[PDB]
Amino acid sequence: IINGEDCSPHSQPWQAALVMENELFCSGVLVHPQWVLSAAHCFQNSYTIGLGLHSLEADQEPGSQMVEASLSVRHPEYNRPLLANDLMLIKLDESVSESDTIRSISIASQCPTAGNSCLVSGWGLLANGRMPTVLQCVNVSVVSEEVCSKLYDPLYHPSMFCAGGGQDQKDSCNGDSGGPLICNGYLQGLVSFGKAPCGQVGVPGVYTNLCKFTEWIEKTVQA
Amino acid sequence: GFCQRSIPPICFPD
Ligand SMILES: [Li+]
């Protein structure tokens, strides 16, 4: 997260850390007690998932869990066309008893609208090029589909939307993939991709457009 | 110049 700050502890209780050999490679979002959304480009044969976390380095905070997940499924149209349909569902090996610090979030029932006020969180690269130990949070605003399609020429697809791009240079970055973009209090997007470098003036980040996938997600959950 | 924002990221010629 570029130009954010430490999140209030456990204020994003749906945040999931995806780690391998105890090293984060992506985030995800808890959407039901046994289901985590993430970017399809974060796909692995197995996962260790940190829930209820604030720090990655600290001793187990009260309420935190490290849970295994051995099953996941990418959207059948991931990367067709390139970069599009960037989502997958990870099924936890055990359902989590939701608690004060581990809670699912519901997906937005409206598609993104320019001007929407959002929050993105994650443990990805900071403005200073370092990785944080503590979960970072920053505000970004949705821009119009036409802005997104111009900026991400030639690869814009309706499974994507854009947020950020402000003169404030607030953005997601490497390591933030799969994490939540919360707009008006609902899960609106997952961090997906952007231009390198992250945090350029006039260049928003790209997020998976979850409102387009609610049917697929719930069909998969119920199957 | 586009990168999928995992760590390490997945970057493309554009
Ligand atoms: Li993992």
Numbering used by the authors:
A (entry chain A): 16 to 38, 40 to 67, 69 to 74, 74A, 75 to 125, 127 to 130, 132 to 147, 150 to 186, ...
B (entry chain B): 1 to 14
Quote the paper.
KLK4 is predominantly expressed in basal and secretory cells of the prostate gland with lower levels of expression in a number of tissues including breast, ovaries, thyroid, testis and developing teeth. Over-expression of KLK4 has been documented in malignant prostate, ovarian and breast tumors and is associated with metastasis, and mechanisms underpinning resistance to androgen deprivation therapy. In order to investigate further both direct and indirect mechanisms of KLK4 inhibition here we describe the structures of KLK4 in complex with SFTI-1, an engineered SFTI-1 variant, and with nickel (KLK4-Ni).
To investigate the structural basis for increased potency, we solved the crystal structure of a KLK4-SFTI-1FCQR complex to 1.3 Å resolution. Compared with KLK4-SFTI-1 there is an overall increase in the buried surface area and number of protease-inhibitor interactions, consistent with the increased inhibitory potency of SFTI-1FCQR. Binding can be mainly attributed to improved interactions at mutated residues P4, P2 and P1. At the S4 site, the KLK4-SFTI-1FCQR structure shows conformational selection and/or induced fit upon binding, where the replacement of Arg at P4 with Phe is associated with a movement of loop VI towards the inhibitor, suggesting an improved interaction. Deep in the S2 pocket, the KLK4-SFTI-1FCQR structure shows an interaction between Gln4NE of SFTI-1FCQR and Tyr94O of KLK4. While there is still a requirement for hydrophobic interactions in the shallow of the S2 pocket, this observation provides a structural explanation for why the polarity of Gln is desirable in the S2 pocket, and goes some way to explaining the preference for Gln>Val>Leu>Thr at the S2 subsite previously reported. There are also several secondary effects that contribute to improved binding at unchanged SFTI-1 residues, notably P2′ and Phe12. These secondary effects are seen as unbroken density for Pro13 and Asp14, which can now be fully resolved, in contrast to KLK4-SFTI-1. The KLK4-SFTI-1FCQR structure shows an alternative loop III conformation to those obtained in the KLK4-Ni and KLK4-SFTI-1 structures. This single, less-frustrated conformation was maintained throughout all simulations of KLK4 with SFTI-1FCQR.
